[PDB]
Structure formats: C-alpha cells, structure tokens
Amino acid sequence: GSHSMRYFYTAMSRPGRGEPRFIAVGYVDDTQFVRFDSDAASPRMAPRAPWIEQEGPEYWDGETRNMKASAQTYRENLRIALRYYNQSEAGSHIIQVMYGCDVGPDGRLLRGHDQSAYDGKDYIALNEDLSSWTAADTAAQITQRKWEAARVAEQLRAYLEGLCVEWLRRYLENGKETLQRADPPKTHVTHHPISDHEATLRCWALGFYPAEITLTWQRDGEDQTQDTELVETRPAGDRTFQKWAAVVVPSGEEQRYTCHVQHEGLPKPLTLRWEPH
Amino acid sequence: MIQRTPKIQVYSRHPAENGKSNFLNCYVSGFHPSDIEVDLLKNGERIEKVEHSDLSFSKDWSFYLLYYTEFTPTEKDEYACRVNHVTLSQPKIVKWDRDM
Amino acid sequence: QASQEVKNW
C-alpha cells in the first residue's frame, strides 16, 4: 500500500553543561534505519536496520558530512531563536524538525512534509503545495521571509519530489522482506478478578507490524470506548508492536463482551472472547 | 514553556513464563523537554547493562524512548522501571506486572 | 537519504 520516509532532528542547547547536542533519526514507515548523535566520540550516521547496511562508504560518509553540517546549522539556529524571542543564554531550548515524503501504491508522491518546532511548539511548516510556508508566530515570520527570499521551498520541493521518493522506493525494495511484509497480531483475552463481583477483561495484540491497529471492546455489540482503558501502541523491541485494551466488567457478564481487532496483516477483522477452556 | 510529563509502560517482549529468557522493556513517551532519566530495577536496585533507543518524537513533538534489557523472569524477583523528569517531584517507579 | 538543504533561521 502506502509508504513514507521521515527524518527527525532534535537540537538542544545545554548552557553551562556543554555544547548543543544534535540527534537525527530516519524512519521508513515504522522502522528506524539510521541515527546520528553529535555527542558520540566519532559522530557518524550509523545503520539501525539490516537492509540499510548494504549501502557503500560514499553513502555513509555523505550522510555523516550532512549531519555534521546540519548540527552546526542548528546550533546557530538556536542562537537565532534566542534573538527572535528575546530569551537569555541561561535556559535550555530545543529545536525539532521532521520532514519526508508519503507515496502511494503506485510509488507516486502523495504529500511532502517539512515541519519545524521550537520548544515543542509549531514554528514553521512547508505547506501541502510544497511552495509556501505557514508560520506559527511573528518570530517564525522572520524566518519565513528569509526562506521566501532564498527560495528554500523550491529546494525542498526538489528533494521531496525526487531524492526522497527515489531513495524510499529503493529502501522499500532492499528491505522488502520486512518493510512490505505485514505481520498480523497474535491475540488473546485475559481475565483478572478485581473482587468477587468485578473482573478485568484485557484484549491483547502482540507481534504486529505496522503499528497502526484498532482494538475495541463491545458489550452486546455496543461499543465501550468510554469505559475502555487503551494503552499506547508500544514497541516490543524486535521491530514489532504491542497494544491492549481493558474493560472492567461485572462478574457474570464476561461472555457478552467481544474484542474486535483490525490490522492490515489480518485477512479480516477478529472477534475474540474470554476462552476459559 | 509547555512541559509534558512522560507516560510509562513496563512490559516484557514476549509473554513471561518463569525461568525462560525474555526482554524487559520500559517505554516512556509523550514527554517534553527531552531530558529524562530511566532506570530498570531488579529488587529495587539498578540493572547495570541497559540499552535505549535513539531519541525520536511523535507528531505532536513529544519525545519517546525505549529502554530494554535481557532478563529471565522468576517468582521471587520484582522488576520495575524508574523515571525522572522535570515534571516529577519524585522519580516515578512503575512495577512490572506480567498481566500488563 | 537525508536532505542537504541548509535551513538558516
């Protein structure tokens, strides 16, 4: 189906403790494949997935040079932000950037992204047209005018439409056995008495990829979202994901509750009940 | 500056059964700023060789990290995750419960 | 592959 590539930058000043740190990670769909950390002894863009290791030394040397220069750029951007917001040198501040491309089943670009934040709030974003910007405040409008004057959006449109799509299609091919292979969740319902009159029903989904999933509890076919505790989808550590949903039910009503699991790796949605035997 | 306190989930990679090797995970998410300290505990004491993922963040700009170690669950041993963040008055300890 | 376009604020 659809796929995406994303890079995430975090630049963080640490006044009085050290130079500003710069961390970059790259993802194809829900799979991280590269990382860079300016705090490392030898800062290098490094592989984080098996299918990216086959890239030659020119790729890794080029990615490392880019990440080192990007780190210097965002160290300077942190100083500029202090100017725009009239903030002191004493405080620690954070710039975050995420950018990348979404492609459809045809490998055609669906949407490009280039979003920046300052201290965890929207700062400036490339619009869907890949030619204009949206600034969140008057400080970011200063940056916007500079980027309009320097024709920055044209350069990012060229990347998002070209190299982003081309490299993603190539990463998808090199890692086809995992990236284009959907693992359905393995599911079961557990039962945990709270008292002699109440019990928790927990519906589990384990070992699935990609992370998108829908878990819902129904009682006599009626959705129980308001009474369902739904944990965040969480990484298992082996590039698969887990999730559960739980409801507190009165003792004796357990068999009227059904868990419904929707995942693209499934031939069709599941319906689960507590299976005491 | 908006500060967001971390969500914490402590869990095993596979369904735990006593005496068999597994992985102990502590997933922290939804927090900001990025400064966070996570420790995996065995019987109240820090586990020494713990690895963590590279710092990333979600669409709302909040960060997330996975801390993990190899472990073998038993009946006598209690495992937990301890998280410190600027939003917390005391380090938050979440005990590992194989039912969660 | 990461974008090489420089973003000066």
Author numbering:
A (entry chain A): 1 to 277
B (entry chain B): 0 to 99
C (entry chain E): 1 to 9
Quote the passages of the study that discuss this structure, keeping the authors' original sentences:
QW9 can be presented by the disease-protective HLA-B*5701 (hereafter B57), but also by the typically disease-neutral HLA-B*5301 (hereafter B53). Here we examine the CTL response to QW9, a highly networked epitope presented by the disease-protective HLA-B57 and disease-neutral HLA-B53. To explore the molecular underpinnings of differential cross-recognition of QW9 and QW9_S3T restricted by the two HLAs, we next determined the crystal structures of QW9-B53, QW9_S3T-B53, QW9-B57 and QW9_S3T-B57.
Despite HLA sequence differences within the binding groove and differences in TCR recognition, the structures of QW9-B57 and QW9-B53 can be superimposed remarkably well. Only two notable disparities exist in the conformations of QW9 bound to B53 and B57, at residues Q1QW9 and E5QW9. These differential residues located at the HLA α1 helix also generate a unique electrostatic potential (ESP) surface for each HLA. Though QW9 can be presented by both B57 and B53, our flow cytometry results showed that HLA-I tetramers constructed with respective HLA alleles and loaded with the QW9 peptide only reacted with T cells from persons expressing the matched HLA molecule, with no evidence of cross-recognition between alleles, indicating a dominant influence of HLA genotype on TCR recognition of the pHLA complex. In contrast, QW9-specific CTL lines from B57+ persons maintained cross-recognition and killing of autologous cells loaded with the QW9_S3T variant (P-value: 0.5408).
